[PDB]
């Protein structure tokens, strides 16, 4: 043993963090209350200690409920599993609802209007107990998803050459608050088999790309039918989760403006399916999905 | 219903703790401890720990379930968070041992001054039949650098049993040393783990020696995957780097999550496995 | 001066327990302890259990002060307190069992695997004058549904001593069975007490069998009143159930309190009683 | 958890005294005081009182949780005891005084020389529907002698409030005087204590005129049952004695546990109480 | 190196208590003892005690390092705060004994409800020879009120051995009583214990007689100098005082850091001395 | 035993302090972690017992390493083991420094600004691992420092006369922050011979003396040559201490003031030498010299 002064007060020096685990299709999350406060709980490394699924609570990400901003019911904020923050999370806003229907003690339909780096997002809990959402409108214009690339239809960018490594495949760029890069396969190539990618190789070259000043989100897809498409998803600092909510209602846009599915659509996710639709009336995407309590517990910091 | 639990880690090999001191009988079943495993849609952890009522004598009993649901019948990481586990939850302070009996035996953890947990990991068993391996020993009745053919590929290993089966290898037969960092073990790992040569299953752990006191490895658990470190495992090795000549007795292992202090005393033939264990988060899972 | 001591509970019957084992002489009088059962002006209680030093090689030896001041010379609630009592002074962790000394002989209560204490309350005691009673037995020495005649009504009783008196009713001579909680123990309950047929007071219990396994009752405690539950009692009323042929040697007795699991084993004619107990809390009171 | 405590009781009205001067919020909750008063399987008690910071320039602030639970807005045995209390945690020796913030207002307890302590209990508010009460107001906005119909029976009753309700009877209509200690309160108290002319719930004390400055009383408390006595009971069935031409201002008042000096000073429509407040034991119970 | 130990002290003797139950030699050497007790450059301390495993059957076995290093056979006020401390290590609660072995022979100490300790000090030495001291037996074998030259100044002394050494004196030869506060210790303390009639040095105790019942003293010990208070020596001057008939068996001796009760029973010829021991801070030192 | 609920309430209400323990020259100090409060963990009465040797950790006082204050790295309080608080405090800055080495892994040279109740305090880790502080300019002018003793060289007291106890002795006054009394013999007597002395005889007369109204630290000097300088001091509210780092810059201000020593000197405290430089450049005071922990723990409250 060596004398460590430091290390003595380290051990020393504690913290409890209160939170609630959900999951939604297995994107898992932790929930905290953060109504008390504008101010997140925690920091941002914190939270990518906290993430850590060996030596933390383990978690896709940490999301908090905060006081309403410009008369919203609440905001929201999240921190990626490697601390940066995002600006909108599809899977969370749904846990997110039912995390107030609990602390509310709301029974049956109830909508929230909440704030959010991406605008109002409004989520209801439907009878079933899912939650439909309206995730807002999509942005399509190149330098506000944002990516360098140069808009080929209009000034977005859709079906659009995209050298990774290399390899030049076809990419569409959409915003659902966060950045998203859809890809059907490479230029001059056949569709995929998603289940073949290796994505832990190929992910990182698209989420660090120089193309996507801050980073992206990348989902591969593979069309089963107009209405039917089933996908894989590369996270931006969270790797190859199970789902994602903001990249299923991406890559619907992304299939409508390359032609290749409907505006309504069932996303077939690694860790279950999703209803999105993007409605041609008000140019609202919304996302149907479960959401799940696992167990709640106290961290230390 | 519910389940009230402390989440501990012993090197990056996280398990989830139940006071279970007032039943003989788990709170929960196999099935419902593979769902709490699940790192996505339960809780998350390489297993569950019960904390039992003492057996023919001993302080305490402990019970394992790995995150696949099977019940080993050791776990070195484990008994290290089941000690701690005990103090917190008796506030006991400074140094503590307890004596524990487990499906290897009696095992005896006890708390240091620095807060780690040195155990006496009770004796190896080298014969074969009892590992339990079908391959024959070729060192009497136990099995040092024997051949097995996996995937058609022939390896040299080391069997021996902490309780739970452990396969040792330092390399393919008639091949150079190994860098541990450079196997596939998702692809590797399985072929051991359900070798026909091994009718329970078998834990795996790859080994490079980088001195004959100091040695880094990797292992792929019976039933948990590609963990961050094996208690039992690093005894086991440590016992088959001693019958292959390559090391000595008394030995530091790197696993992936960090270091353990490993010696298999020749005055009496028990392995005492020294390492930290930490308390990380405590909650309430659905069941 | 300051008394130290835990609270303790079985089943609602509230004791006071102190540390005596420097003394085979109770720290307090038996005025003191009534003033300190009080429950408004002092700790409140509905005894005081000295733990004190083995007799005859046993591993100690229990005394109890009733509410009232006097001393019996056993209680079933208060020894399975004793036992939880001397685990935490001694850190005995798990299944203990310890033989006790007390003025009805030997006691073992055994500490259970979930906390609960199974006892080991020795062989009744039958015989009329040794109960002690002034009736007269009719059914060998035994008073077994004899008649009993309080305040000018027929009661028909059995009376069994487990170290201590108890007088067992079912109902009244020629009259249906009982509705316990019908019954105005204050009122009732006195007179059967201080009755002039029991020389040493006695302590009564009214059953209402529900099955051959299954008795419901409420007692009258010498020196204690309506408690809420009475070990030694539920023991008797068992013993008296089985001599009147109501029920079979294996019940669970309810109490106003809560249930305790008695049994009296034909093999050896010895009782089992099984039951909770728990701490409150822990003070000293001025004396 | 755990709960250090020190036990006071003002005539046998017995409670829970914590310092919780460190916070202004109370340590335990109103559930966990209902099962600390229990006396059987707590520590036992009509109540838990809390010494809490000053507020708006008091000493101190009170606040105290009945053994049901509920929260009065006042208690007078309890805040003579919060004196000797604070004295005692203070180590001030002889006379002294304090400003207590409370529920019904300032409140000032004076110990006096001779020990007792002489409390400032404010003034008495008899506007009908802020003691609460519905019934109607027949001298001026205050229900004196009025009818009230218990479970179809037609009682007359006065309402006061000390911050929290009183309903004071002498008899029932155009009955006799009341033999107090004839009356059976478990019976008849509930009926006061929920009749629906009092949507708080309300006290109630039973008064038999011994001569016109000495009163007898016996009283039913919302939410803690028949108690010794009742500090603000007796402040309220003074004032309605004389409300009602049946007593003096300045009375000796009997209760169960003992006797109370009241006084309602004309000069200033305050009235004090003087009586007694004793330490019994302290401790720590499990939460 | 790091050395972890708590903090205790008896009456402001403290004392570096450090758990050496696991081996049966000291973990720091007696050097290394000296430094840690330099108050400015180390953890402060007039010694170092350390727990070690019992010796022919004892539970424990005690060994003690002086603030100079020297090894001293037994210590009273050190023993009492061992005797806490194991109870900690052992998670007792209440009132326990231990048996220990020490220089001095077997010691026993009980924890008493107070939190105090009386410990059975074994008993005096008394031959000359065996203190040790030069000094010649006046009184039987004994050195009672016995001339002692130091530094060319008369003292009368009398010498008991409590395992260590000790040098009593109630004044000078042909002198008055000794107002012990009017002692310039630092200059003649060094004087007796250096002195060359005692070959292993000594403890030497200046005391001045209340009342044949109440002592009060000072004391300069070998290797630890002036210290607030010391056991053993407590015990010695009690002996002393008997022996020259200035003082009762059973004396309350007041030392500077405060008093001890001290009783020579001469029933069996054994000490007992009564004291408090608290734990003052847990720590880890550099080596 | 007597039956007393205060005392009873009073030992269960007991709370835990962590610390490390360091000295300078042996001046022994319990330095504690305070960076997450601009307010002491413990009160001066809390510190006054943990200083007792005997009944308490033992020190001859508490530091607290507090955040820092209008642009400063951090804070520095100390309360003396008599449970007043000083305004600085020379040997225990330079373990402040180790400290905060320690605490953040500072490796080699590493200096910060520390806030005193003197002011700005720099030290700094130098290359042989001593600690050589800016101690900041003297303050000189008598009713600052502050003395009721009229200036005779200027608003400064230097080689005045004190009558203490009815003896007449010389003295000269100056303030590092804290006030220093410093004389080198009686007046009109011979040098000192600083080891004869009785300080705690001596040493209350002039710390509690009349002329002081904050009370006073008291040097004793001998001078051995123009640039070694042996002292002994009797510190306000703490005794007779190994060393004092406020102590040795003030007598060596005071030495160069009545023309005894140059502005460089090696100064002999009980505990060890200082290297002390009063710049004639820029009027600072830079003290050099040792720090060391001892050992770490907790203690009850
Ligand atoms: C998949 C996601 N959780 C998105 C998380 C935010 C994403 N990692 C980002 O950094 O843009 C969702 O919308 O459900
Ligand atoms: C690695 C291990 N956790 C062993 C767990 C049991 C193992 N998965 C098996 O099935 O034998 C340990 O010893 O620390
Ligand atoms: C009911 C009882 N507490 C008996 C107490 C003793 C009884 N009051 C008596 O005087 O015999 C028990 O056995 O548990
Ligand atoms: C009798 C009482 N304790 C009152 C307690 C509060 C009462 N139970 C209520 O609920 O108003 C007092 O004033 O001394
Ligand atoms: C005073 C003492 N600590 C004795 C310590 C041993 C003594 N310094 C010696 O050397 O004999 C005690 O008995 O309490
Ligand atoms: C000697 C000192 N520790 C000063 C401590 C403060 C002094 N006791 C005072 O009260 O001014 C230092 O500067 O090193």
């Known amino acids: 043993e060596k004398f460590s002064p430091a290390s003595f007060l380290d051990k020393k020096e504690t913290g409890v963090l209160h939170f609630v685990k959900y999951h939604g299709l297995g994107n898992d999350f932790i929930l905290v209350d953060n109504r008390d406060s504008s101010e997140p709980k925690?920091?941002?490394?914190?939270?990518?200690?906290?993430?850590?699924?060996?030596?933390?609570?383990?978690?896709?990400?940490v999301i908090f409920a905060m006081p309403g901003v410009n008369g919203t019911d609440y905001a929201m904020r999240i921190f990626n599993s490697d601390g940066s923050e995002p600006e909108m999370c599809g899977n969370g806003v749904r846990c997110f609802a039912r995390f107030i229907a609990e602390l509310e003690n709301l029974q049956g339909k109830h909508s929230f209007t909440i704030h959010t780096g991406a605008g109002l997002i409004v989520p209801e809990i439907q009878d079933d107990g899912q939650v439909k959402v309206d995730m807002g409108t999509p942005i399509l214009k190149a330098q506000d998803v944002p990516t360098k690339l140069s808009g080929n239809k209009g000034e977005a960018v859709v079906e659009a050459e995209l050298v990774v490594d290399g390899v030049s495949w076809n990419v569409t760029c959409v915003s659902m608050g966060n950045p998203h890069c859809i890809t059907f396969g490479k230029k001059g190539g056949p569709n995929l088999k998603v289940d073949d990618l290796n994505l832990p190789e190929i992910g990182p070259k698209f989420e660090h790309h120089e193309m996507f000043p801050a980073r992206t989100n990348t989902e591969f897809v593979e069309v089963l039918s107009r209405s039917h498409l089933k996908?894989?998803?590369?996270?931006?600092?969270?790797?190859?989760?199970?789902?994602?909510?903001?990249?299923?209602?991406?890559?619907?846009?992304?299939?409508?403006?390359?032609?290749?599915?409907?505006?309504?659509?069932?996303?077939?996710?690694?860790?279950?399916?999703?209803?999105?639709?993007?409605?041609?009336?008000?140019?609202?995407?919304?996302?149907?999905?479960?959401?799940?309590?696992?167990?709640?517990?106290?961290?230390?910091?």
Chains 1, 6 share one sequence.
Request: glycine share 14%; hydrophobic share 40%; net charge negative.
């Open 42 to 61: 925690i920091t941002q490394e914190q939270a990518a200690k906290l993430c850590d699924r060996n030596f933390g609570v383990g978690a896709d990400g």
């Open 231 to 301: 996908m894989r998803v590369w996270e931006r600092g969270a790797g190859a989760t199970l789902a994602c909510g903001t990249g299923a209602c991406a890559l619907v846009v992304a299939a409508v403006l390359e032609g290749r599915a409907d505006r309504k659509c069932t996303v077939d996710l690694p860790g279950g399916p999703l209803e999105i639709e993007w409605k041609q009336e008000d140019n609202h995407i919304y996302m149907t999905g479960p959401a799940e309590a696992v167990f709640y517990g106290s961290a230390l910091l």
